[PDB]
Structures are given as C-alpha cells and as structure tokens.
Amino acid sequence: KSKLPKPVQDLIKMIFDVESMKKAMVEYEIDLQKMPLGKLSKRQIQAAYSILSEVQQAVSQGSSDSQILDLSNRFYTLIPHDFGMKKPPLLNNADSVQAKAEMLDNLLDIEVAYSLLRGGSSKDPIDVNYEKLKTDIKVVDRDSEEAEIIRKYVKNTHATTHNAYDLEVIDIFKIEREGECQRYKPFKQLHNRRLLWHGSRTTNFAGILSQGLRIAPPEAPVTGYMFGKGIYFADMVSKSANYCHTSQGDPIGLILLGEVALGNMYELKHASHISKLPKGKHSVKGLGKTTPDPSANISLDGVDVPLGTGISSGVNDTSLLYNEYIVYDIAQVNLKYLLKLKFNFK
Numbered sequence: 533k534s535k536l537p538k539p540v541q542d543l544i545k546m547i548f549d550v551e552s553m554k555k556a557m558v559e560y561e562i563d564l565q566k567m568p569l570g571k572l573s574k575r576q577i578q579a580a581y582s583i584l585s586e587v588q589q590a591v592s593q594g595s596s597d598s599q600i601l602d603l604s605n606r607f608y609t610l611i612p613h614d615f616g617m618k619k620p621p622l623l624n625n626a627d628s629v630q631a632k633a634e635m636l637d638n639l640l641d642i643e644v645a646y647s648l649l650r651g652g653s654s655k656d657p658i659d660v661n662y663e664k665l666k667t668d669i670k671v672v673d674r675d676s677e678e679a680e681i682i683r684k685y686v687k688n689t690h691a692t693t694h695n696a697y698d699l700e701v702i703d704i705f706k707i708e709r710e711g712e713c714q715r716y717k718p719f720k721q722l723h724n725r726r727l728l729w730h731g732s733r734t735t736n737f738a739g740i741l742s743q744g745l746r747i748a749p750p751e752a753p754v755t756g757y758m759f760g761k762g763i764y765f766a767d768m769v770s771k772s773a774n775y776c777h778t779s780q781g782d783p784i785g786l787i788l789l790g791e792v793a794l795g796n797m798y799e800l801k802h803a804s805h806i807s808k809l810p811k812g813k814h815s816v817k818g819l820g821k822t823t824p825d826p827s828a829n830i831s832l833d834g835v836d837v838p839l840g841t842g843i844s845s846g847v848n849d850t851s852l853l854y855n856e857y858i859v860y861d862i863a864q865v866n867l868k869y870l871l872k873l874k875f876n877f878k
C-alpha cells in the first residue's frame with residue numbers, strides 16, 4: 533500500500549532493478565560466477581582504478597611489454613572477466629584503459645544501488661526504497677507550463693547528427709536531493725546559471741540521486757577526458773541522451789536537468805588538460821560548431837534555459853560539433869528535473 537504517484541513508483545522500480553544490474557555486468561563480460569553482484573567491493577574497485585593508472589603511466593613511459601602485461605593481468609584478477617572465445621584485451625593503450633575506467637565508474641554506482649537496496653519493517657515496498665534515495669521526487673503535471681518549457685527544450689535541441697532515434701518525454705519529475713540546496717547556496721551568487729542536460733545509464737541513478745553527480749576519483753586514470761575530471765553537461769539533449777546507452781531491448785532512459793552555476797566560463801575549442809582553472813574562471817565551455825539559437829534563450833527563476841534550435845555558432849576550428857560544459861566542484865550543481873524518455877529508434 534504505497535502512497536507515491538505511480539510514475540514515481542515506476543521510477544523507483546527501474547532504478548533499483550536487480551536484473552538490470554546483473555545484465556549490465558554481463559554486458560561488461562564480467563564473470564558473475566567469480567564476482568557476483570553481491571560481492572562488488574568499493575575497495576576492490578578502488579584498487580582496480582589504481583592499477584589502470586599504473587597501466588596508463590606505463591603506456592606513456594614506454595615500459596616493457598612484460599611489465600604492462602603483468603599490470604593488465606593484475607587488473608583482470610581484481611575484476612574477473614569471461615570472454616568466451618576471444619582473449620581479454622591487453623590493457624596497453626588509452627582506449628582500452630578508458631573503456632575499463634568507464635566500466636569501473638558504472639560498477640561503483642551499481643555497488644551503491646545494490647548495497648542501498650540490501651540495507652536497513654512495515655512500510656510499502658516502493659516507499660522504503662524511495663526513502664533510501666534521500667531525494668524528494670514529485671511528478672510535474674503534464675498540463676503545466678513547466679512541462680511545456682521542458683518539452684520544447686527536448687524537442688528543439690536534438691542534434692541533426694544524432695539521427696539514430698527520436699525522443700518523447702514520458703514523465704517529468706522535479707527532484708530535490710537532501711542537502712543539495714544548502715551545498716549549492718554559495719554558488720547561487722555566481723553569475724551565468726544555466727539549466728543543462730546530463731545523461732547517464734539507468735543503473736547509475738540510485739547513486740546519482742543519493743550522492744549527486746560526482747567527479748571521477750583521483751585513483752582513476754587521467755586519460756580519456758576532453759576537459760579533465762569534472763562534471764559534464766550539454767545544451768543539446770541528444771548529446772546527453774547518447775550517454776544513457778539505451779537500446780531497442782531497453783529503449784527507456786533517464787536524463788537530468790541540472791542548474792549549473794557556470795560563472796565566467798573558460799571557453800575552449802580543443803582538448804585542454806588542466807583540471808585546474810584560471811583565476812576568475814569557474815567552468816569550462818567547450819565550443820561546438822552548432823549552438824542553440826541565442827535569441828530563443830529564456831530566463832526562468834534567474835536561470836538561463838537555452839531551448840533554441842541548433843544554429844551555426846560561427847566557431848571554426850573546434851574539435852566539437854556541439855557545446856559542452858564542465859565544472860570541477862560538485863557543489864556547483866543543483867539537480868532540478870529527472871526526465872523519463874522514450875527512445876524511438878530508426
């Protein structure tokens with residue numbers, strides 16, 4: 533006998549789905565016989581990051597192949613895999629290291645979700661797990677102007693290059709993470725506050741909601757980030773929705789709208805490797821060739837919502853088709869909405 537609206541209950545069910553957790557491990561080709569979901573360890577995972585860092589430093593050092601193979605095997609001992617016919621790829625290159633690092637990040641949030649679900653007896657089922665997210669979740673009436681702005685944002689900022697799917701807003705939730713208002717308070721005085729997209733895999737949202745958007749830990753390899761270890765956002769919904777990793781088998785994804793206090797944006801057209809920021813700068817803006825039409829930006833409770841159609845930016849010589857935004861302090865993010873999206877594939 534649960535009191536939450538059904539869409540909120542359906543959200544709680546999808547994010548605490550144990551079958552989805554195991555399926556994600558299977559897709560990563562983890563050996564579940566040797567490392568079940570119930571044995572995932574934050575300490576083992578932390579050590580796995582560190583080994584990936586040693587591997588990364590040894591590609592760049594030009595170390596012996598015996599030293600590299602040995603490090604790559606230590607990683608596979610920490611996180612056992614089952615590749616069937618092929619061999620476990622040697623971890624001897626940036627792209628192999630980044631793939632295992634992105635997987636470790638996903639694994640950590642899966643550990644957060646499952647250890648939450650298995651943590652500390654007369655309340656309704658969906659409601660006890662809802663409380664573990666420490667997030668107030670309310671459904672946004674579809675008939676509201678609130679909903680109308682959000683659907684125009686989604687409709688107008690789908691990229692032309694991301695032709696593989698269309699998007700339909702199923703549910704719009706307004707969320708308030710416990711303690712995030714207070715944590716965000718100092719940065720509300722930063723100028724240039726923007727409502728931006730951040731996509732992630734569904735198996736990440738129990739961790740995202742209970743802990744907020746986080747930065748990769750220092751043990752993690754420095755390779756693989758266009759703008760270093762930070763929190764990344766888009767102003768084009770499909771650039772973030774690509775990060776849901778949804779498929780035809782599971783075509784439902786979750787995407788966040790976060791208020792991000794950008795302040796004075798360090799504008800860059802190519803990969804730069806300071807995670808440090810210049811004095812007076814509070815964020816990085818990667819400049820894309822296409823940007824939402826600035827004329828159609830609107831201000832909503834003092835926050836810019838760039839809902840315009842993508843138009844040429846005039847920015848030539850950039851590695852980026854579309855903008856992105858990075859902040860390096862987790863307190864610069866106040867999560868506002870969680871969208872349940874339907875992907876209708878080609």
Ligand SMILES: NC(=O)c1cc(F)cc2[nH]c(-c3cc4c(o3)CNCC4)nc12
Nearest residue numbers: 730731756757764765766771772775856
């Ligand atoms: N999630 C997003 O919505 C998103 C939106 C953007 F406009 C740019 C992004 N870049 C990344 C991202 C994730 C990882 C890396 O970059 C580097 N390697 C580790 C994992 N995410 C976004």
